């Protein structure tokens, strides 16, 4: 059907077609190798994000427990002091009432002393 | 005119089988590159969500600690004022107790003087 020259021209055509397809394979392998390397950089950085996020969540749980331990201890110191103010103030009022009753006894004893001394400047 | 018609036809079949192999490689490498590009997009879309969540939580922690620091300032500043109030009331209570002991000694002396003055007038 086909001559020698026609088969040679088709051979020349197929060889140029093999050369083009081989440049595509080499181009697609360079692309795939960069994309696989880019996927490795994204996976190493995403691993670090989850790893820092886990580290910061575990140190925050122990920090909140320490803040609770410090907040309880300062609070109990404020309550012990406030109660001490209420007790010192009431004991101060009970001492001031007792002192004013004593002054009334002294004022009565002083009047009694003067009354008896006018009696002795007569006898 | 080196090669015959039958030799050129067998070579033609040979070049075609190489094109069929290269065409399966190109289609295979395009599926790999397309899957890898899609995987990188899923990693970059998730990386951006993590960074946006990580950015919100760092801003909610920055403002939360500022209130914790201000509640620690306010519960502490109340405890300092109470301690000052305890030390002041303690001095006022000690001088009221000294006055109470001063008054009781005065009463006992005035009563002895009253009895002595009553014995002079015979009351």
Residue numbers in the entry:
A (entry chain A): 20 to 142
B (entry chain B): 19 to 141
Direct quotes from the study:
Inhibition of the protein-protein interaction between NEMO and IKKβ represents an attractive alternative strategy due to the crucial role of NEMO and its selective involvement in the canonical NF-κB pathway. We have previously reported the design and characterization of a coiled-coil stabilized NEMO construct encompassing the IKKβ-binding region fused to two ideal dimeric coiled-coil adaptors, at the N and C-terminus. Here we report the structure of the unliganded N-terminal domain of NEMO, utilizing the coiled-coil stabilized NEMO construct modified by four additional point mutations, designed to improve solution behavior and crystal packing.
The mutation I65M was introduced to provide an additional site for selenomethionine labeling, to aid in phase determination (NEMO-I65M). Ile65 was chosen for its expected buried position within the coiled coil, providing a more rigid methionine than that of the natural sequence Met94. The SeMet labeled I65M mutant was prepared to facilitate the phasing of the EEAA structure, but displayed weak anomalous signal, and the structures were instead solved by molecular replacement. The I65M mutation affects the opening of the hot-dog bun increasing the interhelical spacing of the three heptad repeats starting at residues 65, 72 and 79 to the values observed in the IKKβ-bound structure. The longer side chain of Met65 extends deep in the interhelical cleft and the structure accommodates it by increasing the interhelical spacing by 1.4 Å and rotating the second Met65′ away from the center of the bun. This increased spacing seems to trigger the opening of the bun in the following heptads, till the end of the stutter “heptad”. The open region encompasses ligand binding pockets I and II. After residue 82, and approximately at the start of pocket III, the I65M structure closes back to resemble the apo structure, confirming the role of IKKβ in maintaining an open pocket III. The conformation of pocket III is instead almost identical in the I65M mutant and NEMO-EEAA structure, both in interhelical spacing and in side chain conformations, with an RMSD = 0.372 Å over all backbone atoms within residues 89–104.
